[PDB]
Symmetry: C3
Subunit: 116 residues, 3 copies
Amino acid sequence: PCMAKFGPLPSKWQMASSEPPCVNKVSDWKLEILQNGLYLIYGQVAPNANYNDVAPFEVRLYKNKDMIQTLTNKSKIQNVGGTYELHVGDTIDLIFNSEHQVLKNNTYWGIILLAN
Amino acid sequence: PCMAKFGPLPSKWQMASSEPPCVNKVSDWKLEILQNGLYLIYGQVAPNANYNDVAPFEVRLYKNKDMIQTLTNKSKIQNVGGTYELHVGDTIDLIFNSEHQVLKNNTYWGIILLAN
Amino acid sequence: PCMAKFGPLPSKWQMASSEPPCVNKVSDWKLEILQNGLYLIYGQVAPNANYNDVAPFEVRLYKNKDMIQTLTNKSKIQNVGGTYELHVGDTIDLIFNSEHQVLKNNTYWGIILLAN
């Protein structure tokens, strides 16, 4: 199997595949796709309940430059991802409006190659 | 493969895995997770069209004590589940506001282990 | 693996399975299920931005005669599908309110057999 997961704390990027790998980590919360195929993106955002800064609550999942998911709910744990056919060079990134909107000890996302 | 499905009638819990199993049935509509891993929960709620009792319409999917899905639509067949990384000891349960809100001959949920 | 995908242009139905096959193409955008099992339907609708005809915007996914997904958003790329236990004889079809509501060079759907 080829899969990767970022977080939650203490972990950053964790990876497991054969050679050649299907993905490579770019930086915290961001990955590049190295093989064409059918992937399942998964994970969860646990929103910090006592978040009281001025930035509105929003978490955004990016495929390349385009948002593919917006999470707007400050109370409940919400799933990230879905099923995506992805191509070589694509990136996936999870971006928080404020690093404190979220509980990084219970926030993560990952990916698994399902098929070519 | 490791998988399990509850219902629909006439069936209750049906299971198939190797030893040791990845899940074990707790009771009707309720399962315990026995291995850490990436699961896909699936299934459907077929709402009883002629439901006329006082209880409002709602079906709830639970992970442990927390609702992970609420189904509020009394007319259409609606999918249950999604992709969840689950841990040893976790339960998943499907709870109906009234056993008659739903058509148990066309209502079920199941689970498959995707990866460790 | 057993899988099939329609589109995007230039492609129509593309298939790959062992014998006997799990699905067979009926016609453009429409497939029949030949084996009972757990499938994942995937894909995306890329809405034509400059769509200005009288037909309202809607894309519908059908399981047999019943809509299982409605896509109503004229601006963003939106995912199609989810996880469905499907039976022999079932059809899946993707229907557009107007063939021009959508960019067929970036519109497709596919299916993969996950388990029996």
